[PDB]
């Protein structure tokens, strides 16, 4: 049928919440001053990234942190990461939910560990995206929402 969809622009911007820390506190994390340090930008620009749906932050004990793993080994944001956020944002998934599936090692996932050559069955999808095996993560994101 002739029926165009008025969904030309996806809503990839909104208010991204910060709530329950999914990663364990011993896992490497970034903090607002540290990200400001990393990108060479003010804290306010870091907050803008968060407002633009480029990055996600969670709260541990009271402090707001951003997992190291959201940034590549080059200290850059993963290109398709705001992309996953786009689909999950449209699906109405909160910060805690995003990291939920993302930090859960999947038994049916067998990927090579980032930095390594070897394959790990039942690994965290984070290593997949960090090693540009992101498509499986995008798939998992899609399956999680739509």
Swiss-Prot record:
InterPro entries assigned: Rv2175c_C, Rv2175c_wHTH
Region (Disordered): 1-27
Function summary: Binds DNA at low salt concentrations.
Organism, scientific name: Mycobacterium tuberculosis (strain ATCC 25618 / H37Rv)
UniProt keywords, alphabetically: DNA-binding, Phosphoprotein
Annotated domain remarks: Contains an unusual winged helix-turn-helix (wHTH) DNA-binding motif missing the typical third helix.
Self-association and partners: Monomer in solution. May form homodimers. Interacts with phosphorylated PknL.
Recorded GO MF terms: DNA binding
UniProt-recorded name of the protein: DNA-binding protein Rv2175c
PTM annotation, UniProt: Phosphorylated by PknL. Phosphorylation negatively regulates DNA-binding activity.
Domain of life, per lineage: Bacteria
């Amino acid at each position: 049928m002739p029926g165009r969809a008025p969904g030309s622009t996806l809503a990839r911007v909104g208010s991204i919440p910060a709530g329950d820390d999914v990663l364990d506190p011993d896992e490497p994390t970034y903090d607002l001053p540290r990200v400001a340090e990393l990108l060479g930008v003010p804290v306010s620009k870091v907050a803008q990234q968060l407002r633009e749906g480029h990055l996600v932050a969670v709260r541990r004990a009271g402090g707001v942190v951003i997992p190291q793993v959201f940034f590549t080994n080059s200290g850059q944001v993963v290109k398709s990461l705001p992309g996953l956020l786009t689909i999950l944002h449209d699906g109405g998934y909160r910060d805690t939910e995003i990291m939920r599936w993302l930090f859960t090692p999947d038994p049916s996932l067998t990927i090579t560990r980032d930095g390594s050559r070897d394959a790990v069955s039942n690994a965290r999808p984070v290593d997949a995206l960090h090693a540009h095996q992101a498509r499986e993560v995008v798939r998992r994101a899609q399956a999680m929402a739509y």
